[PDB]
C-alpha cells in the first residue's frame, strides 16, 4: 500500500515511510552498532557508531537518524562501513580509562563488545588521557564519569521518561561533562534506570558494587510484587544468593523499566 522498497545488502525489504536505516536493517535481522540510539528515547545521532554506507553515495550516513529513501541499498558490511566503525571506536577508546578489571560493567559492557566485534585490535594513541571528577547524585547510582562516553542517554531518559530535567552537559569540546553542575541528588522513583541504559560503567548500581560479575550469575525470570503493576524482572543469583534485580522487557506492562523499590 504505502510501503516502499529498500535493499539491505541487496535483499529487498518493504518498510513504511519514516523508517530509519537502523530499523530497515532490523527487519532483515541485522543490528547496526550503536551507543547513543535507544528505541525508547529520542534520536540523538551524536556517537556516530551507526555510520553505514549507502550504495552510490560518497558519504556514510547515520543509520539511527537517517530516514531510508526508496531504492537505497544499505551496505552494512562494506569496507567503507567497517572503516567508519573502527575510526569511531578508536576515538571512543582514546580517552577511556583502563578500568575494566575494577569496573562493574566488565563482562556486560557495550563498549567492550562492540570494540571486539567492530573495532581495531590495538591502540595508536600515544598521548595522555583525560580525567574527570566524580559527581555524587545519591545513594543508588555510583558515578565514575571518567568512563562516560558522552552518549547523553541518561540526559534524555531523565527528561523524557522520568520527567526530571536535572541532568545535562556543561562545558564544551573535549571537556564537555555530564552531570548536575551542582551538589544535587537525582532521586526519583525511576532513577535506577539510568544504570541500565548507560552503555558504560559511568553509572553503576551502588548496592551491587563489586559483588558479582555478569558471566557467573544465573538469570531467573520472575515478577515484581512491590506494587500492583506486576513488572517483569530477572533475578540474578550467584551460588544460591540473590545479587541484583533487573528489568525484563514486557511492552504491555513495564517496557524495560522498573521503579527504584523493585530494583
Amino acid at each position: 500500500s504505502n510501503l516502499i522498497e529498500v535493499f539491505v545488502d541487496g535483499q529487498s525489504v518493504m518498510v513504511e515511510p519514516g523508517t530509519t536505516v537502523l530499523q530497515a536493517c532490523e527487519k532483515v535481522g541485522m543490528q547496526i552498532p550503536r551507543f547513543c540510539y535507544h528505541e525508547r528515547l529520542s534520536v540523538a545521532g551524536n556517537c556516530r557508531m551507526c555510520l553505514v554506507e549507502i550504495e552510490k553515495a560518497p558519504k556514510v550516513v547515520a543509520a539511527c537518524a537517517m530516514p531510508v529513501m526508496k531504492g537505497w541499498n544499505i551496505l552494512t558490511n562494506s569496507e567503507k562501513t567497517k572503516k567508519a566503525r573502527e575510526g569511531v571506536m578508536e576515538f571512543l577508546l582514546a580517552n577511556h580509562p583502563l578500568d575494566c578489571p575494577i569496573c562493574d560493567q566488565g563482562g556486560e559492557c557495550d563498549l567492550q563488545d562492540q570494540s571486539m566485534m567492530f573495532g581495531s585490535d590495538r591502540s595508536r594513541f600515544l598521548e595522555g588521557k583525560r580525567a574527570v571528577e566524580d559527581k555524587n547524585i545519591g545513594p543508588l547510582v555510583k558515578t565514575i564519569m571518567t568512563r562516560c562516553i558522552q552518549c547523553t542517554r541518561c540526559i534524555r531518559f531523565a527528561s523524557e521518561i522520568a520527567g526530571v530535567d536535572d541532568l545535562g552537559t556543561t562545558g564544551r569540546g573535549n571537556d564537555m561533562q555530564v552531570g548536575t553542575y551542582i551538589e544535587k541528588m537525582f532521586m526519583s522513583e525511576l532513577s535506577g534506570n539510568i544504570i541500565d541504559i548507560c552503555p558504560v560503567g559511568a553509572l553503576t548500581s551502588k548496592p551491587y558494587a563489586f559483588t558479582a560479575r555478569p558471566w557467573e550469575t544465573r538469570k531467573t525470570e520472575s515478577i515484581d510484587v512491590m506494587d500492583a503493576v506486576g513488572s517483569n524482572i530477572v533475578v540474578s543469583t550467584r551460588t544460591g544468593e540473590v545479587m541484583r534485580i533487573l528489568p525484563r522487557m514486557h511492552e504491555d506492562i513495564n517496557e524495560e523499566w522498573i521503579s527504584d523499590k523493585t530494583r
Binding site: 575494566c100 578489571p101 575494577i102 566488565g106 558494587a209 563489586f210 559483588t211 560479575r213 557467573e216
Partner: protein, 176 residues
C-alpha cells in the same frame, strides 16, 4: 624420501656363514651387550643427593599459588574474577565487596589445590600480578582439608615467598 630398516640380504659366502656360526656358538653379540653394562658400572651415576641437592628449575616454574602485594603492603588483587573465569578446573572461588575505605577487594579467595591443574592461566589472566604460581613445590599435606586454601593461607604464602617470587618475575616479565 624413505629408507629400509630391515631389508638386507645376508651374504652366503663361506667366510660370512662361518662368522654367523661363530656368533651363534660363541655368543659374540651377547658378550658385546655385557660390555655396555660393564662400562656403565664405571661411569659416574646421575643421581643427586636429595634433599641436600635439588633438581634445576627456571623462573617460569609453576608451583604453589600465592597472592602478592604492592611495595606499600596493599593487596594487588582488586576482585576482577578473571582468574576465576579462566581457571579451566573451576578451582577458584571469589567473593568481593567494597572495603571499609571503599576499595574493591575480595572477602573470599579460595583455591582448591585438589581441583587445580597448575596450568598457570590464573597468573596470565591477572592484570595486576596479584595471583601467581610461586616456586615452592614441597607442600604435601597429611589431610585433604589442608589443600583447600583460603585468602589467609594465600596471603601468607605471598608474604612467605615474596623474596623469591619478585626475583622470578623480574627475570621473566620481559618474555610476557
Amino acid at each position: 624420501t624413505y629408507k629400509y630398516v630391515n631389508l638386507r640380504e645376508p651374504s652366503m659366502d663361506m667366510k660370512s656363514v662361518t662368522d654367523r656360526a661363530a656368533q651363534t656358538l660363541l655368543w659374540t653379540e651377547l658378550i658385546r651387550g655385557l660390555g655396555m653394562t660393564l662400562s656403565y658400572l664405571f661411569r659416574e651415576p646421575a643421581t643427586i643427593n636429595y634433599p641436600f641437592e635439588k633438581g634445576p628449575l627456571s623462573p617460569r616454574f609453576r608451583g604453589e599459588h600465592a597472592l602478592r602485594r604492592y611495595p606499600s603492603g596493599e593487596e594487588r588483587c582488586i576482585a576482577c574474577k578473571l582468574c576465576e573465569a579462566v581457571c579451566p578446573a573451576q578451582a577458584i572461588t571469589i567473593e568481593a565487596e567494597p572495603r571499609a575505605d571503599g576499595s574493591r577487594r575480595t572477602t573470599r579467595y579460595d583455591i582448591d589445590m585438589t581441583k587445580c591443574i597448575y596450568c598457570g592461566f590464573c597468573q596470565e589472566a591477572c592484570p595486576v600480578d596479584a595471583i601467581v604460581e610461586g616456586p615452592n613445590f614441597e607442600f604435601s599435606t597429611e589431610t585433604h582439608e589442608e589443600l583447600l586454601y583460603n585468602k589467609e593461607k594465600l596471603l601468607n604464602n605471598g608474604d612467605k615467598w615474596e623474596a623469591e617470587i619478585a626475583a622470578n618475575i623480574q627475570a621473566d616479565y620481559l618474555y610476557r
